[PDB]
């Protein structure tokens, strides 16, 4: 090209609406997992927009440094536009064209990139857009919503807003309602301060009514009914779904979750195995298998008062071995799957494989780009491992504190404060000058709103370690609290 035809192009590129401008960061996902599962959905979730899936795959290919392959994906997108969006060819091409411009930009084919921005600017003008190189569009809001969801729990609020934007235009659009309801469904399980949420129940009912032939949306409704103690109603939906479809991994896997949660583990395993025939590498399926084996194992341990003998013991050890295999497989398929790490590590611990559990816990504690909620739970589980398996009370205290610092309102809050109190009190009976324990009690009382008692503990800790910066800050906060 030339400089400043370039410098102008870069400005335009930033004005586009497409994946490159939606702040989808590669560090937040396992690129191989995301790439692989997009392909699986193209094959096995046939109700999801192929156009959106190929646009997204193209972006992911670019993120792997495979710009040449990104182009082939966008060509597939263009074919789908003719196949399924012929009547709206131009407006449906904007995201694809945007991705094209950015990919050609990254390949240093600036002239080619400018061709695409030109086509975009053209269509926007034709359609009376208030912006030069983008166009407000419910369809695009929906695509963005799904792209956001795919980048993980950090994006769920942004995804909800994106679907809301689409529903503002078409409140009764079948596709828009599915996206919204699923987003709200996931948020019901995200960042819980407490008990089960069911804000998705209404949206799910609507989405289901608007999509009467869609077994994928229906399975979430069944799960939500289970959550709200309408298990019998939800189970009838499951039965009806399983009559209408077969072998669909994105439906079976959720039916299997439903059955597991009412302790029908053999049925769950049956469904999961059927799904695995179709998609053997799915981290979701492997995690679910692990959960099933874990539950069966726990039932036996409980029945035999944690002292299984003979064949019960042989069975427990097989289940531990099988749970490990599947948790490990899930973790190896998806490096960002926090619960796969913690579930694997906990099972290693259960089996007395402490070196293996420590290795996994270490990796889990170094995951930077997961949600604070997940970091919170990792600290909690490492803490318990330290407390009950390593018998290392000060390491446990450290991680219980880290858990509360990352997230201080969650369903683990009282387990965390009560364990800290117990441990710190015990240690202070042995050594009244134990600074960590004094500091821990200061932290917990501060958290509980007992300002005066907290200040007393921090003052005792500061008396011993006068230059401590954490203790000075805590005391200032306590003095200045309104
Ligand atoms: Na996934």
Swiss-Prot record:
Q: Which GO terms describe its molecular function?
A: double-stranded DNA binding; poly(U) RNA binding; RNA binding; RNA cap binding; single-stranded RNA binding; tRNA binding
How the protein is affected by changing residue 284 to A? Strongly reduces binding to dsDNA. No effect on ssRNA binding
> One Pfam family name from the record?
TPR_10
Q: What is its main location?
A: membrane
Q: Tell me the impact of changing residue 260 to E.
A: Abolishes PPP-RNA-binding
Q: Which GO terms describe its biological process?
A: defense response to virus; innate immune response; negative regulation of viral genome replication; positive regulation of canonical NF-kappaB signal transduction
Q: What is the effect of changing residue 288 to E?
A: Abolishes RNA-binding
What is the protein name for this chain?
Interferon-induced protein with tetratricopeptide repeats 5
What organism is listed for this UniProt entry? Homo sapiens (Human)
Taxon lineage: Eukaryota, Metazoa, Chordata, Craniata, Vertebrata
Q: Which gene encodes it?
A: IFIT5
